[PDB]
């Protein structure tokens, strides 16, 4: 993936956390995926992506939080694919 991902990272110009963030994840290398979160105050994944993570429950509660925003029927004005 490493060749076609640096083609992609040359094209997705400043910026999109609902696209170039996705392509960096489809071939990890999370080391540099953190320096790229510079533009977000969200290195939540700065240590999460590099590590194995809590798995079973940590990210499952991220999931539950999502389920809950969903049920809340609130936060309708949210990023189109930030949900993806």
């Amino acid at each position: 993936a490493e060749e076609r991902i640096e083609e992609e990272v040359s094209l997705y110009g400043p910026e999109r956390h609902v696209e170039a963030v996705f392509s960096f994840l489809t071939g990890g290398r999370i080391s540099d995926a953190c320096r790229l979160a510079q533009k977000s105050g969200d290195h939540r994944l700065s240590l999460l992506l590099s590590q194995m993570v809590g798995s079973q429950e940590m990210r499952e509660l991220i999931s539950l939080q999502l389920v809950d925003w969903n049920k809340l029927q609130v936060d309708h004005y949210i990023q189109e694919e930030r949900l993806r």
Partner: protein, 401 residues
């Protein structure tokens, strides 16, 4: 002591604020609390000293290609106890802060919950209707970093609730109750923040040495990256002072922790907490053979030396008036010399206090001094004596009078 403290607390709470008659009560109630915290301290430290002296004996495993920190620390505990005493001072100071929290942990549940709500959401829906004049620019997204990334504020109520939550999370962490802080984050709907408080867990894979049953991997293998992120978050002034202090506590950033420490106990705790983190990570790194890097801190960070004395020298150099006032209180002087293991210096302070006026010493302090000397004598640690006899004589004459 706790039985009488509980009685006196009930008496002081029933008194209308402004009766000068109960001031003697408040002052010696504080003295009684210090005395209770002194018997607990004696029990903790002398139990360790006696147990250590009985096991000042066997050993011994050295090194492995591996570097599971758990294994490095388990091997340290065998041969080094100097670092341990600093963690006992941290655990002691975290226990004091826990006693101050009391049942307030249960009362936090009334203020930090789920709601019938509106909110930034109502203002965003109303702006979609008409272009209302004099409208403050609020965040457009509800992800946790949106306020910082967009440089836009939350609604003033939500911002106040976040500041209040962060203050409570810091109080729970200062009390050693990191699991209650994580439960509070999950209950408030901030399960993401609960996960950020777990990144300090030591990496351990019990399967590396070939067990009969597969055990679950523990801790965070990306600790160095997580710690570097926590350090950057502590230095960023866009974050609230308590959020900075939470991540400062968790990453060893003393400079960003000190601004929220208001008492002597908070200041001592900040120094000892960062000292233990610093020494632990220096040992983990010295155990390393190769690998990449979460940090390259200036050389001033690596040549820094942490000692019991240097902590109390920095406390004397503080600009905080309250800490400088509390640092002159007889019990904090005793606690300093007990931490330093300097019995001879403690006996000089006792000689000075007896010389500056025998009648100015409070009766409970003279009791504490007497029983502390009897405790040291039981350890064959009498530590000078003409003076010990003259303190006892002066206290006996006071009890007679």
């Amino acid at each position: 002591c706790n039985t009488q403290i509980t009685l006196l607390k009930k008496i002081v709470k029933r008194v209308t604020p402004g009766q000068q008659k109960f001031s003697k009560t408040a002052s010696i109630l504080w003295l009684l609390q210090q005395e209770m915290v002194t018997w607990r301290l004696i029990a903790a430290l002398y139990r360790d000293r006696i147990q250590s002296a009985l096991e000042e004996e066997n050993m011994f495993e050295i090194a492995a290609p591996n570097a599971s920190e758990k294994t490095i620390v388990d091997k340290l505990f065998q041969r080094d106890t100097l670092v341990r005493q600093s963690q006992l001072v941290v655990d002691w100071l975290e226990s004091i802060a826990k006693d101050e929290v009391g049942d307030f942990s249960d009362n936090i549940e009334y203020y930090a919950k789920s709601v019938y709500w509106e909110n930034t959401l109502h203002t965003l829906k109303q702006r979609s209707m008409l272009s209302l004049g004099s409208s403050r620019p609020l965040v457009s997204e509800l992800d946790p970093d949106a306020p910082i990334r967009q440089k836009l504020p939350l609604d003033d109520l939500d911002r106040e609730d976040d500041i209040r939550l962060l203050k409570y999370l810091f109080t729970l962490i200062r009390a050693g109750m990191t699991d209650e802080a994580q439960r509070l984050c999950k209950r408030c709907g901030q399960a993401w923040r609960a996960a950020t408080l777990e990144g300090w867990k030591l990496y351990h894979d019990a399967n590396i040495n070939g067990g009969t049953e597969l055990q679950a991997v523990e801790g965070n293998p990306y600790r160095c990256v997580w710690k570097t992120c926590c350090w950057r978050m502590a230095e960023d002034e866009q974050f609230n002072k308590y959020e900075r202090a939470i991540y400062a506590t968790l990453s060893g950033n003393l400079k960003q922790l000190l601004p929220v420490c208001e008492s002597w106990e908070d200041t001592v705790w900040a120094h000892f907490k960062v000292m233990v983190d610093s020494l632990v990570e220096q040992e983990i790194r010295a155990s390393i053979i190769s690998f990449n890097e979460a940090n390259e801190l200036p050389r001033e960070y690596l040549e820094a030396n942490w000692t019991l004395d240097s902590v109390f020298e920095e406390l004397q150099a503080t600009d905080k008036k309250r800490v400088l006032e509390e640092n002159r209180e007889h019990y904090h002087i005793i606690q300093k010399f007990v931490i330093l293991a300097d019995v001879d210096g403690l006996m000089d302070e006792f000689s000075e206090w007896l010389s500056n006026g025998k009648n100015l010493l409070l009766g409970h302090l003279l009791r504490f001094m007497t029983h502390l000397l009897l405790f040291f004598r039981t350890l064959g640690l009498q530590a000078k004596e003409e003076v010990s006899v003259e303190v006892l004589k002066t206290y006996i004459q006071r009890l007679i009078n």
